[PDB]
Subunit: 91 residues, 3 copies
C-alpha cells in the first residue's frame, strides 16, 4: 500500500530525536527529548525528505532537504525558528 | 526499473555500519564490523525506512523507523535485542 | 508529481554538508564547506541513495549506498577519490 516516507536525526546522549514524515506532499515533524513524543514546529511542502544535524557546543543545528519535482528546498533550524537556506541544485 | 530503498548509520572506531534495505514491504539489515559484511538480526515489515543512532559511552543505540501506510513503527536496538519503541505520529 | 530523492550527511562544526540527489537513475552531489554550495565529484547510477560518514580527526570518510533494482553499490570516499566498497546485499 502507499506509504509515508521518513527521515530521522538525533543528537546528544538523552538523546533528542527528530523524525520528519512526508505524506502526500506535506512534511511534518515529531520530536523526542526524553519525556514522550510531541509535535514539532516544522511544516513545509515536500514529497521526499532527508535531514542532517550537528552540534555547536550544546546548540543544535538542523538542515531538512524537502523535494518536490526536481526542486529541493533546504530548511534550517539554528535555535530561533525555521528559515529557508541557501541550498540550490540544478536538477 | 523498481529499486529497493536503503538507510544507513555508522558509529565508533571500527567503524560499525548498518545498512537497512526495504524491499517489497520487508526491511532487512546488513552489518559491517571491520571483518566483512554479514546479515543482521533486524527483520521487520515496512515499505520505507530511515535510521538514526547514537553512542552513550561505548553503548550503541539504534532507532529504525519503518513505515507502512501512515503508520511508522520505531524499532529500538539497545544492546539486547530489537524492541518496539514509543514513537507515534499523532497523540 | 514524481520527485527526486535525497540523502544528506554533515561533519564538524563549520559544518561541511553533502547532499546526494537521485534523479531519473542518476545520483549527483552538492557540497557546502561554509562558503557557498558547489557541485561535488560524486556521479554514480542509482534510483535511491543513502549515506553515512565519519571523521578521523579532520579527515572525512563517506559511504554512499546507491541502489538500482535489488543491487546496492557502496561508494567510498577516504580522501583520495570515490572507490567501490565491499558491500553486498547477500552472501
Ligand atoms: C491494502 C493494499 C492497498 C490499499 C493497496 C495496495 C496493496 C495493498 O495490500 P498490502 O497488504 O499492502 O499488499 C501490498 C504490499 C505488501 C506491498 C509491499 C505493495 C503493494 C501491496 C498491495 C502494492 C501497492 C499498492 C498501492 C500503492 C500506492 C503502492 C505504492 C503499492 O506498492 P508497494 O507498497 O511497493 O507494494 O496502492 P494502494 O495503497 O492504493 O492499494 C496496492
Ligand atoms: C529494465 C526496466 C524495467 C524492468 C522496468 C522499467 C524500466 C526498465 O528499464 P531501465 O533500463 O531500468 O530504464 C529505466 C530507467 C533507467 C529509469 C530511471 C526508470 C525506468 C526505466 C524503465 C522506469 C520505471 C519502470 C518501473 C518502475 C517500477 C519504476 C519505478 C520506474 O521508474 P524509474 O526507475 O524512476 O525510471 O517498472 P519495472 O521495474 O517493472 O520495469 C519501468
Ligand atoms: C503536476 C503533476 C504531475 C505531472 C503528475 C501527478 C500529479 C501532478 O500534480 P501535483 O500538483 O503534483 O499534484 C499531486 C500531488 C500534490 C501529490 C502529493 C501527488 C500527486 C499529484 C498529481 C500524484 C503523483 C503523480 C505522479 C507520480 C509519479 C507520483 C509519485 C505521484 O504521487 P504523489 O506525489 O505522492 O502524490 O505522476 P507524474 O509526476 O507523472 O504526474 C501524478
Ligand atoms: O523543542 C522543539 C523544537 O523547537 O525543537 C527544534 C526543532 O525540531 C523545532 O521544530 C521543534 O519545535
Ligand atoms: O545559516 C544558514 C546556512 O548558511 O547554513 C549552512 C548551509 O545550510 C546554508 O545553505 C544555509 O543557508
Ligand atoms: O552484531 C550484529 C548485530 O547484533 O549488531 C547490532 C544490530 O545491528 C543487530 O541487528 C545485529 O544483529
Ligand atoms: O528505550 C526506548 C525509547 O524510550 O528510546 C527513546 C525513544 O526512541 C523512544 O521512542 C523509545 O521508546
Ligand atoms: O571538496 C569536495 C569533495 O572532494 O569533498 C569530498 C567529496 O564530497 C567529494 O565528492 C567532493 O568533490
Ligand atoms: O574499502 C573501504 C571499506 O573497507 O570501508 C569499510 C566498509 O565501508 C567496506 O565495505 C569498504 O570496502
Ligand atoms: Zn505498500
Ligand atoms: Zn529504476
Ligand atoms: Zn508528487
Amino acid at each position: 500500500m502507499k506509504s509515508v516516507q521518513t527521515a530521522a536525526t538525533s543528537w546528544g546522549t538523552v538523546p533528542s530525536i527528530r523524525v520528519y514524515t512526508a505524506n502526500n506532499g506535506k512534511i511534518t515533524e515529531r520530536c523526542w527529548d526524553g519525556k514522550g513524543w510531541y509535535t514539532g514546529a516544522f511544516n513545509e511542502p515536500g514529497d521526499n525528505v532527508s535531514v542532517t544535524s550537528w552540534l555547536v557546543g550544546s546548540a543544535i543545528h538542523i538542515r531538512v532537504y524537502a523535494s518536490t519535482g526536481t526542486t529541493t528546498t533546504e530548511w534550517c533550524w539554528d535555535g530561533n525558528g525555521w528559515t529557508k537556506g541557501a541550498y540550490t541544485a540544478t536538477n
